[PDB]
């Protein structure tokens, strides 16, 4: 289901650039062995969501420094209490959630 696939793949690329700043390759690969090999990301996709993610800013890129030079992608501090707020807000509603089997 494209959009909550789409979803999914965000909030996999943001935990990752959680994890510490990366690379369009690298992030595959991660991607690859942390699924054990069923979700193989192409390049186009994550080029795509990065474009609107640092448009948006939620992540920046530099030049990293053997011959170079990978462009590495960080998350920003924007990013970074957005996930922290996300988390907040999501867990009272988890709260909400547990209260209304309760009563």
């Known amino acids: 289901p494209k959009e909550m696939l789409r979803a999914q793949t965000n909030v996999i690329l943001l935990n990752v650039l959680k994890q510490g700043d990366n690379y369009v390759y690298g992030i595959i690969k991660q991607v690859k ?3 054990n090999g069923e979700m193989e990301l192409n390049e186009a ?4 969501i990065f474009d609107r993610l640092e448009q948006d800013g ?3 890129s530099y030049w990293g420094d053997q011959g170079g030079r990978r462009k590495y ?3 920003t501090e924007i990013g970074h209490e957005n996930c922290r707020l996300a988390f907040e807000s999501w867990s009272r509603v988890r709260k909400i959630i547990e ?5």
């Open 33 to 35: 062995e942390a699924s």
């Open 73 to 75: 992608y960080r998350l």
């Open 58 to 60: 939620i992540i920046s």
């Open 45 to 48: 996709t994550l080029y795509t």
């Open 99 to 103: 209260n209304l089997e309760a009563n």
